[model samples]
Every structure is written in C-alpha cells, then in structure tokens.
Target: FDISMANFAMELYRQSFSNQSNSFFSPYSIVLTLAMTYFGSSGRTKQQLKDRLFSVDDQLQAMQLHLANRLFARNNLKLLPAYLTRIQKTFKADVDLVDFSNGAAAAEKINRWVARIKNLIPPDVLDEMTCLVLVNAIYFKGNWQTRFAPESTSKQYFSVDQNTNKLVDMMHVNDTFRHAEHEQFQILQLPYESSKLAMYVLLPKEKFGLEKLVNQLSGEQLLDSMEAVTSKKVSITFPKFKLEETLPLKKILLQLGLTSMFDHSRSVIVSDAFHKAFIEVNEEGSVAPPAVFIADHPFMFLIADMQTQTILFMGSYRG
Candidate 1:
C-alpha cells in the first residue's frame, strides 16, 4: 500500500515538475503531512483522502522511527480530544496550539519549531489567514560505512545534456558496494554507518535516458532492482551537491485527486498544505572505497531507510 501511494505521488510530481528546472522533493514529508490532515477529515472528504493517500497499518510505524510529524492549530480553534489522541498514538504527532491571528508572531513561532527540527519551511508560509498547519521533518545525517578520501576528490566534467558540460567537484572512492546494472540504467546502494539508511543512486546509461527511465520504471521494478544489488568491489565517482526546495504542493495534490483538501467549501481536513526538503551529498566519511560506478552525467537519487524500505528524500541532479 505504501509503495502504491509512493509511486502514484511520484508520477504526479514528475508530471507537475517535468518542465521545471532541476527538481527535488520529499514525497515522504508531503504524504505524512497530508495523512495528518486525513485524520481530521470526514464524509466525502475523508473518502477522497483515503482513496488518494491510503497506507497500510504499518506505514506510520515505519515512519515513527525516522520521521517527525507534528500538527499546529490556531490557538482559538478547539479540536476534539479524540482527534488529538488518534494522531498522537497512530502518527506519533504532537499537537501544538498557536495564535495564528497574530500573523507574524505565529509564523515566527512555527519557523523556530521547524528550524529546530532542521527543516526549511519558510516562516512566511503561514500568514494571518492561516488556521492550521501539519508539518513533517526528517533529519538524516549518516556517515558512509566506507567513506571517500578527500584527497581523491577532483574536478570532473558532468554532462548536463548532450551539448552542455560543467566542471563539478566529483568525490571519488573505491570500495565494495551493492550494485546492479540493467539495460536502461545502473543501481548503486551506498550504505551509511549503521546500515539502517542508504543513498540509492540510479544513473542512466545515456544523457537522454532519464525520461525513458522515469516512464518505464514502476515501483515493483525499482524494488526488484534494489533486491538484485550484490556486494562487489567498485570505484564510485559521485558529485558533491546540496539541494533545498520548498514546494507549494496544493496544485500537485489537487492534480493527484486530493481536490477537497484545499477547497474551502469542500475541504474538511486542511486549509492549505506545503512541503520543504533539504539534502546534501559530499565526501565526508572515514576513508576506504572500490567498484567503478561513475555518475558523470544527470542522475536520480533517493535517500531511504533500509529497515523499512521507506524513501525519506529523493531528487534529480542535471549536473
């Protein structure tokens, strides 16, 4: 059930952001916030939420270990104790009351909370008109089980497209990694120190291969590819990059059949919804590295919790 929603949401986002520039988003964060909204909805609205974002009983259990979900309500608004208790137990969310009428003050308070959680949602995302907000923050900083040597890092040409190439600071390391290759692309799993989290790099065989890969790849196919990875000695050449993106997901959600959640007259669950995500990839690890997995062109990546097979963050880098 989680996999179904994940793939559906990704397909929706890919179509929505297809024309945009290099893009990144936390589907994990977006879905978690909406799930909280779902808890408050009833009637047709609740049905819509269920149809669009339904998850298995174990979904929240998996996220509780690695994700932080919270609900913030207007101080004057009264919420049912049952609703509060449901979220608290099932989603592991803390309910906080804030004075939303005090626009700037409320926004600042929310901003502080988000920053404290290492999330990047803008302070002004909430205004005087704002009544409720559901937020999810996931902070994952993991040391590579086998780190890359700083001395081995060097400048390399990363092809942005057929005609464009950019010099990027590529990090290099040679070590045994779980890797597999198919006709369309290659999959490499780089584990963190605890083996609970890992970054899966999906590098296309050609610069123009990404579009096809996106179109052809299914959730089951991706899962199968990951399972096929085998431990092998390889050299990895990865670029170091950091990405931060805040998305107004109202339209995207609507496009994905979540219409009532944003409509005032129809919405029974939420007033508005948004998402912010941040990720960094670099050569910071204790040294030892093998197999040759050179990501010298545009590629897609996902930072996932190995224990639950949940994707915490995912994005594409064109350079």
Candidate 2:
C-alpha cells in the first residue's frame, strides 16, 4: 500500500486545484471512503474504483489520530447484509438510516454526530435532494518535540507576491534537526512530541516557485526526498499558518476518472462526499530545534505516518 497510495495521493493532488491560495485535505479519509464505496459496488463500478483499495488497521494502531466515516441514508433504503459486513470490516464505517425527506432534521442529527467526534466541527454540505451523505471527519492534535518559545514568535513580512507583503506571525527557533535541499527547493522535518508522526515542510527556492514545486511533486519523489535527509544544526523562521477547510470532493473527484461513482447502478450514486480536516501548527506541536530554513513564502506540508511511510494529511499555503 505504500507506493500505491502515495501515487494515488499525488494523482489526486494534481487534479484538485492544490496550487490555489490554500487547500487542505485528509486524503486517508477519502481513501477510506472510496474503499467503502467500492465494497458495495459490483460490475464496472467495482472495476473502476478497484485500485483505491490495505494491514490498514495494524499500521494505524501506532498513529494517534481520530478519523471516522458515517453514512446517513434515507430511512426506506434497504442494504444487503454482506455489503454491511464489507464496509464495517474494511472501513469500520457503520450505516445509519435517516429521513432525508426531512433534510433539516436529518442534517441536524448528522452534524451532531460529527461535532461530537471532533468536539466542534461540521462539513456543512447537505441539501433538499440529498438522499445519502458520506461524511469523513478527521482531527490532528500534535505538539512539537521542542516547543517553540512563544516569545520567539513575532510579526514578520511574508512575501505573498510582488505587490503584496502579508504580515504573518513568524515562529523562530534555532536547534539541530533533519533537513535537506534540492536544486530548486528545501525540505525540513519537525518531529512531534507524540513521535509516531512528523510534519515535513517543503519550501521552494524561488519565492514564487511553490506552484511549480507542488505541481511537479510526486509521492515517490516526496518519499525519496524524505528518505534522503541528515541531521544538522539550523535556524528556522516559520510562518505560523494554520486553518481548517471543508472541501467537497465531488468537484475535485469529477476532474479525475472516478465517474462510475456519480452514475451508479446501485441507484445510490454518491449524492455528495464531504471531508473535514483541521490542523494547528503552533509554537506547541504535541512538542523542534531549527536551521536557516526560512519559510517566508508559499510552501507545502505533509503530516505522515512514520513507520508505514503513509501520508495522512496533505495541503498547501500561499500566504
């Protein structure tokens, strides 16, 4: 599942407008949902989404993160017994019957379940025609291994473009860490106090090179870059950029060839697939010492599973 999932991640990133201002997604949830959908599919629908299929449990046990999938369907919908088993065993998502005829009440119940999962977060993507909704909620809470002295953070000029200089709270620290540089970009690894995961940042050499950098990024290439890094004492000026997003995968997935999902033989085509993800990279990580790795421009970040070499969260920031 390593290279296969990685390749799929990059493929999805390319199709999604990731180069825009800022975009964040927990690809793992999408991966899980796709697998769950595939479980109930047959004929060409199964064939179309076949490759998106994982020792998924054994690996995730080592990671500290919360992810859940819930299917809110119309009360009259009848599901087969074996299909239910497939979703439960493969994705651990149990089905719930709701009266979409009364979309408002159904939506309220669905949102409450999601909010309880993350404490306070909602995807907010349901409407009148919505008969079924597949929702994925994911939350990541990690502190830096070496907490950034909050005092070290100060207002810094973040270059967004030639005409505009956005002021951002840049967090500064100097310590030993693992980092490496390519001909056109640089990458750094900040380990979390909850050590099983690490957030890797990729900064382009040219101030405005992020678009090219991300557009050309491949999962295998990313893994190889992470694979080739050494420890060194460095200075880091990182812009504390944190935000949450509720992205509708229908727009993004339509760009790719996941067409069978939209036109289903199950008569239960995906009405809407919503994913919600939140990230906070404060002077507190769960716990870094740093290098001259200054992130004064747009960059890419990935929070990955260290042991399994799987990328859980992938996003980009342009401010």
Candidate 3:
C-alpha cells in the first residue's frame, strides 16, 4: 500500500508543481482522508475510490498505531454510529462533532484543533457551505543520532539554476552513514533518535537532474536503491531548510482518475478535502563529525518509517 501510494504521490507532485518552485506534501494525509470517504461511498463511486486508494486493512492499522488522525462532523447532520465506529477502528480517527451552522465559528474550531495537534491548516479551507470535513494531521520530531557541529557550519552557495545561486547556511559533518552511489543519484539515510524513523536524501548527480530522476523512478527501483545502500564513512554538508505547504488536492486527484467523488451528480461520500504538511531540517543533534555527500544544489527527500518502509512525507528542495 505504501509503495503504490508513493508512486501515485510522485506522479501527482510532477503534475501539480513546476520545476522552478519549492513544494512539499503529505501523501499519507491525502490517502487517509480519501479512505474515510471510501467508507461512506456506494456504487461505482465507491469502487473507483477503492480501486485507486484502498490499502490492506492490517497494513493501515499498523501505520495508524503511530499516527494522529481525526474526523470532524457537524452535529446537526445525522450520521450512522456504525460508520463512525468503523472509521475509528480502521483509521484510528476520532470523531469531533461541532457546530457548522456558523461558518466562521466552525472554521475557527477546526483550526484550533489542528493547532493543538501541531499542524497549520488554513482556516479558510472550510466555509458556510461546508457540512463535513476530514482533518488528518501527522506530526514527527526526531533528533539526529549524530549531531553536526555548530562551529563547522558556514555560508555556502546553493545553485538554484545554471545562472542563479543563493547563499545558505550549510552544516558540515564527517561520520559513518548508510550511503550509496548510483549513476543517476546518491542515496543517504539519516536516522532519527529512535532509529525507526529516518530521512532518505536522494541527491541527483547533476545540478538540475531532478526531472530526469522523477521520470525514471518507480517502487521497485526505489527498493533496489535502498537495498544497495551500504554503511560507509561520509563527509556531509546539508543546508538548514524549513518547508510548509497547504494543498487542495481536488484537481490533482481528478487528474489521477478520481473524478466521480468531486462531481455533485456522481459523488456520494466526500464533501471536501485539504492537506497540510510541515518539515524542518537543521544542524541540531548529538555531537558528530563530517559528510562527503554535499547537498549544495537541488535534491529530493523522504521521511519514512524504517520498520514498515512507509513514507510519511516527501518533497524536493530546489534552491
């Protein structure tokens, strides 16, 4: 399920954002929200969503044990208890009944809940017309197993394009890490405090090689690359970066062959869906020293659960 969704997510990224812009998204949020909708749908609408977004029940349950997910409903609108229970059991989502009669109040209530979970979704995502809203928020904060030295950090040039570059604060470290080199790209897995969560940095060999890498990437190829990574002493120079994105995935989902759910006549379950994600990478960690792998240009990153091989977040940094 993770692999299939990863592939879908990569394709969606290519279609939604252009080469020159910085973008970040949580595929997990999008899929989980849609999966909840799938539960309420019927007929061909249900089948199409199930065919495209459904995952094995056990796998989803396993991932949910590590996630914080929720569903919000208008108290005035009558809903089936069975359906609510099913969502709670399957997606690990708690139901919150709120007043949607006043759009502004409802929006504020939703935003407050989101903030409590350490996520920021635009309050404007919901309005007077909204009756049902699904909010899936995921938060992860992990300290590096081996930290980079603050003294070694210095300004470096990050090439955004052939003719443009920006000065960025790059952190330096030299240590043993799970690393691999291929003809097209280099793979480096940096572990978090628990060792169960890690960030996989895929640096393209060329300065502007991201497009080529995306075009040729697949689940099998990704797995092969991970399997090929070996532990070796590396010199790393990574820039400090923080990214936040709020994406309305309706158009992208439509492009991916999910149309009925968005149309009034053909739709059954979903009212509206939105996704928000945040990530910050810095030099803070336990004291450690050096990386031969310098990410001085555009590169791709993935935050994954090592035990289940699930991608919690994915994005590309172009600067």
Candidate 4:
C-alpha cells in the first residue's frame, strides 16, 4: 500500500512549496489524515479526496519516528457510524470533541494534544477561527550509524546562493556509506540504528546547481536510486542541519484539488487542517557520525523506510 504511495510524497513536494528555499513535510501524515477525511466525504469532495489520497500500511520501520493523526470536532458534532470505526479501528486514531465557538479554549486543548503527541513542545498552530481540525504530527530523533567526533565539527563556508556565503558547522567523518556517484551529483545514504531506515542525501557536484538538479528529479528516480548503490569508503563533510514547520495543509490540499471539506453545506466539513514535522541532524546518529559527501550548499534529502520505500519525511536544505 505504502509502496506506490511514495510517488505522492514526492509529488506533494515537487508541486507545492516551489517558492520556498526550505521545506519539511511528512507524506505519511498527510496521506493518513486525508484518508480519514475521505471516509466522511461525499460527492465531489469524496471523489477528489480519494483521488489524491492513497493507502496506509503502518507496520513500517522508522528510526525513532512517531506519527499520530487526530480529528478535533465541534462540541455538538457527531461522527458518521462507519467513519468513526474506520478512523478509530483502521487508522488507530483518537477523536475528540471541542467547543469551536470558544476557539481559544478549543485551540488550547488541541494544541496541548498536539504538543503531547510531539513529546511536549508546543507548535501552537491552531487558532480561534477553526471549526474542525484534522491534524497529523510526526516527530523523529535518530542517531547516525557512525558517529562524528565532536572535536572535528567546525565552522566552514556554506553557499546560500551564488552571491551569498555563510559559515556553518561542517561535520566530518570517514565511513562506509551506500553511495551512487554521477557526473552531475552524488547520492549518499546514512543509515540509522537497526539499518531499517536511512537518510539519503543528494548533493550536486557543482556549486549553485541545486535548481537544475531538482528540476528533473522525480519520485521514480529517487526510488530507483535507492536500489542502485554500492558500499564505498568515503570521507564526508556535512553540516548539522535541522528544520521544523507547521504546514497549513488546507492551503496545500486546496491547491491540490481537495476542496469539499471547506464548503459550508456540510455540517462536519473541515474548517482547518495542518501537518507538523520536526527533524534535527547533527553528530547524533543511532550510536553517535562523519562522510566525503559535503552538503555545503542547497541539497535534497529523504528519510525513508528501506523495506517499503515509504517516504516518511522529505525536504531540501536550500541554504
């Protein structure tokens, strides 16, 4: 189920957030939450939602990653019989009632729920205007398979753009990595604990060539790259990077043709939807980290399930 859904993850990234230099999102969260919403939708809304949403087979391997989907409905709202069971039983999600008229209190409860799901760091994405909220939160904390010595990390030059250069904490290490090399760019795989999951880094060979690299990139290409790799000794220099964001999924979904829930006729239609993702990559790995693959500029990356090719998280550090 999740095998083919990898394409959707990349499509979402490719179509959306074109103007932004940095992006971070959970394909797992978006797919699951929308699937739950699709169960309750009817007519065109249901059709459009179903077309965009795929399957969820969550018996997956992810390194220190936790995801949760939740629906916060108005105080007087009631779930459809089958929708309730499917979301609760199939998706294993929690449904809660909130007083949408009192948006602040509702937001407070919802935020607290989201915070708890994220291990207690408030994202505060909900607001007073919300009537119903379908939300997903994914949190990941994985250590590198090979740890980088702290003493080796130093401030090094990073190219933000052709005219912009900044110093970043460049990390270094020599290790055996699954790598695929090309004249234009290189792909490096850094595994986490258990070797079930890994972070794939795609760095362009030339400075300031990020836009060209991703312009032709596709989900299928990434999947193929995962399979075509060789273990090689590499001296690596990568920066410690982290990105966190609460994406307004309603905006994204609406643009992607998921429109029915916002209509006024439906009593339980969506009032708001969001996705929150947080990732921090440093010297920390499964055990502790170093690499020849230097990501000194903008680069593309994915944290994925090795067995299923499920893209749990994907982003570009475009700096």
Candidate 5:
C-alpha cells in the first residue's frame, strides 16, 4: 500500500549488491509468502508480520490484502491445491483452504468481492494499493520479461570483488535498452512488452559502490537517487548465472522492521495460521514468465503492481 515503503524495500534490495559480483537473493517470494500468511490468518506470527506490514504504511496493508485475495482466487482450484500441496510437502506450511471457489460463478463472485474491497479505500490509497496488487500478480507470473538466448551467452570474466574474478556465462546483448547513470550507479531498464513490468539493473560506478549503497540505503535515499537517474546509452555486460536460493524471510522481515509480523508470541487477527515462513527460488525454468526475463548473476527485481504502480515484493541477489 505504501508505494514508497515497497519502493524502499526494493531499493534496499537493489542496493544490496556488489559490482565485484552480480547476484540477487529472491526476496520477493519471502516477502509475498510472509505477507500472504498474514492475510490468510492473523496468528501471532501473522500479527507480527502485520506489525511490520503496518509499519510500512496503510497503502501496504491494503495492497497486501488485495494481493492475498487475488492469489486466493486465481490459484484456488487451478493450481492452488497442487501448489499448496507442493509447498506443504516442501516447506511444511500448515495451510488450509475453504471451498470458496464455486465453479464458474467464482470469477464473478471474486470480482464483486474485490470491487467491494476496492471501494472501501480512498482514491490515493487505491492508487498506491493498486501497485501492490500489480506486484503480487506479477510475482504469481514469475520469471523475467526478456529471455536471454542461451546460444548467445558465452563465458566471461566477472569481478566477484575487487581482487577476485570468476569465469561465468554472461548474457550478451546489443539491443537498445533504457539506460541511466546516477551519482555512483548505472541503471538499466528492460521492460516486458505485454506487462508494464520491467527489470531495473543497478551497476555501481566503482566495484564497491554496491556494498556501500546497501549498507547506507534508507527508504528516502535510494528512491531519490534512482529518480535522479539521467538516461544514457551504454554497453552492459550481465553475467549469466544460475542459483537456487531458499530464504527464511522471517529473519529478513524482522531485520526490515517487520518485527511484529514475525512474532508468533503475541498476535490476534490471524489465530489459525502463521507459525513459520520460508521461500525457495530456482533460476532454471521451462519458459520465462511474462513479467520479466531470466535474471542471472546479481540483479534487483520487483513484482510491480502496474495498475496501482506499487511494488508487491522486491529483492536483490549478491554473489
């Protein structure tokens, strides 16, 4: 709901990288999973996550709710059972589902339900909240916009840190891209045509700017700095990498000041669920989703709510 807060979270994630290496920890799933648990049932942990969610802003709360509803509806019968079953098997989430999907009428019913919820919020909140929703949907349709041709990719040298280097398959491209350069970082914008979703790559001017950027990042600073980007053209070299990340987002959530959301001790609202939270990310897939492209190496990503123009979840990878 709070676009800035989500943006701040995204920025924190974006800045949390190093030029020496490019990798991102899939934080979106962690954020989404935690957020969903809160929306599903406000147990003590949910309440704790909610506390963190609320700390972000009212818009965030609204967006979180909207996303939960959408996810519940979209995945209900189709993949809900299978996916949840898989998740349960993998992560052992004690999740439950009510038989709310009433066949073909479910779509209409969901629309009405969403309409009611949407009407309850004010215009500005709706705008901010919409972004959150968009981001959630974007996450559901996981993957990147552009698919790097595996054939074109070649082994390249990567500066893992100032003094270290690694030979990795880096994605190569000569196509025109939306590029920018700010104070200490170079930014690139690669948009997904069908979706308003885009991938923003932040490359530190110096090899170490990324680490410093992450350490000093705040809600305001990163956004302001990114906003100040001056568009430009440059040849970008992005490494092709594959990583499998399984995150215990509860800890990161706590670190991000979402302490209340993770607390299973003193919580109300969600008494039925929310005991533990986790997320897993595997880079290889059959087809890249419509949202973004295959992101290898370290890059920042956000499932943006295109309509509301809010970030549902975002994070970066560091190698």
Candidate 6:
C-alpha cells in the first residue's frame, strides 16, 4: 500500500487494539514506528518538511513541559486550558484558540480539546495532515488501594527472566485481589480509585514470555482474547514498575510499509513547490536543515486518553 493507505490501516488497527486492550495510550514504540516510516522517504530537496516535523516534536516537548508546569501551578489539580492553546498555536501560526471547559462538565475536556485543536487547523493543512497526538498522564500518590504493610513487602526472589533471578523488594498484599490464571496466560487486575482506571497485567503462562507476546501480538490477539477472562482465587506478587519512554517515529514507520515519503524525489505532496524557501534555522543560527531522530534507547513515556489507560510507549535504560 501507499503511505496514506498504510497510515490509515495502521490507525484502524490501532483503534481496534485500543478498544480490545482498554488502553488509553497507544504504545510509544508503535507511534515512533509509524513516524519513522515516512521520515526517510519525504526527500531532502525541500528540507522544510523535515524541519516541520522536528518543530512538531519540539512543540510537543514544549507542550509537555508547559502542561507539567501547569500541573504544578494548580497545586497539581486541573490542567489549565491555556496550555492546550499553546499546543494548538505551536502547530499553526494564525489559528485562533478555543476552550470548551465549563463548570462540572468533566466529559467535555478531551472532546473539546480535540475539537478546538482540529478546528484551528487550516483546511489545506487538514487535508494533507494525518496527524494524531495521544496524551496520557497518571498521578498515583495514594497509599495503595490495597496497601501492603511494610512487613509484608519483604525482599523476595523475583524472576527477571527464565534463568535470571534477582532479589528485590516485591509489593506483597494478602487480600481478596482480582487474580486469574488461564492456560494461555496469567492475568491480574489492579484498579485506580480516584480516576477509575485499571491496570490489567498480562503475564504469560509457563512457556510464554513477555518478549514473545510483544513480538507476536496483533491488536486483536492482545485485546479480544483477554476480554473474556474469568476471575479466580490466587496469590499475587508483582514488582512496582515505573517506566517512562519518549520514542521518535522512524523505525515503526518503516515497519508499517512507508518508505517513499522520506525520499525527496518520490514524495509529491510535500514538494518544494509547497514552500517559497525551505530553510531550517536552529538555535545555532545555521540552516542545518531538519532530520529525524531514530529512537534508540533509554526513553521515558506515558500516554493518557480521557481517562488514564494503556501503554503507548514502553522502553528501558538499554535497548
């Protein structure tokens, strides 16, 4: 398929998986993967396209920082609408800002946010841009919904892998917890009360490991297969993991079948004709043009939809 078709297919697939897994964030790796596919094929003739993408990333980072600051400013209560306006402005120069937030109307937050952002875009840009930005943020400061006493969470032998074992402090809670073990996989459910979010942990059966699951999983297999699970009684021991990742989209795009857009010669829509002078000026005051940063390793990430859910990005200290 062509670039646009491939993106559409990927998005359709993403929606299906999102529904199946009940995830708020699309995996970061997946997003990066999609972006990378088009990065290379989109040509060097007019470097502005590349610069524009870089600018998008930079603006996204700025939005994240602004939102984080706003979070702190509100004593970390409600994130202000101004930050969203800043994000919208970053995309387009002349777009008017709009807010749909009102009293006691929590449901309007995301929809309004998306609508306002979408409405701000020019018709021409909207026609050519297949842009999607998904955000997820979780603030869990609670003394666990199922608080394990300090004594119960002792240093235990945890299995890092098949042959690797590490002695780490695993959170141990002995209470009526949602646990179920199937022949296919082991499932554990943890709920966040304040936001009404649930962390559905999918641990593989004796023979299946997480790596294998990740490698072989399609959107359907991951989401639908787990939905019809039945709860059962069992002991639960899980590590408290806090992982954050920021993945740039280069690899994922190549994987999804988009290569022509990155090449200057092959790309038609994002041609030099679109811009009068495609110049890339960085902080160094030199027009070095724009380039795509392939996501390597050691990235932090989090994704949130209307309600906190999903694992859109997952990475570690090492690749």
- Specify the highest-TM-score model's number: 2
Q: Which parts of model 4 are misplaced by more than 4 Å?
A: 53-63, 116-130, 262-266, 286-291
Candidate 2: stretches off by over 4 Å: 54-59, 116-125, 260-265, 285-291
Rank ordering of all candidates by lDDT, starting from the highest: 2, 4, 1, 3, 5, 6
| Weakest ten-residue segment in model 4 by summed lDDT | 116-125
Assess the local accuracy of residue 13 in candidate 3 as a C-alpha lDDT between 0 and 100.
55
How are the candidates ranked when ordered by TM-score, highest leading? Answer: 2, 4, 1, 3, 5, 6
The top-ranked prediction according to lDDT is: 2
**Segments in model 5 whose C-alpha atoms lie over 4 Å from true places:** 10-152, 224-232, 256-307, 312-319
TM-score list, all predictions: 0.86, 0.89, 0.86, 0.87, 0.52, 0.43
Q: Candidate 3 lDDT, tens digit per residue, 1-319?
A: 6566555565555445545777667666666676676676666666676666555564533311123456676676566777777877776556677777677787787777677355656365356545566665555555788888989999999998899999888988888899988899999988886577778888999888987887777765775676678887899988887776666666566666764334222223345566666667787777443447989988888776676756667778886
Q: What is the C-alpha lDDT of each candidate?
A: 0.70, 0.72, 0.69, 0.72, 0.41, 0.31
Model 5 per-residue lDDT tens digits across residues 221-297: 54554455443433445654433232333344445554332332122222111111112232222232122222233
lDDT: the better of candidates 3 and 6: 3
* Residue 181 lDDT, candidate 3, scale 0-100: 85
Show the lowest summed lDDT stretch of 10 residues, model 3.
Answer: 60-69
Encode model 6's per-residue lDDT on 109-147: one tens digit a residue.
333332312211111221222222222221222223454
Model 1: per-residue Cα lDDT over 102-191, one tens digit each = 777777776677763556564664566566776655555557778889888899998877788899989887677899879989999998
Writing each residue's lDDT as its tens digit, candidate 4 over 1-319 gives 3465546566565557654467778876777676666667777776665465555335452346677678777777656667677667766665687876665666676667766345332235445555567777777878888888778999988888778888888888887889988777899998887677788888988887766777767677778887798998888888887778777677876676656444322465777776778888889753323336888988888787788777778778865
Per-residue CA lDDT of model 2 for 149-258, tens digit only, reads: 78999998888888888889999888877899899799999888867788888999999898788667776788888778899987888878667777767777777767
| Model 5 residue-pair collision total | 39
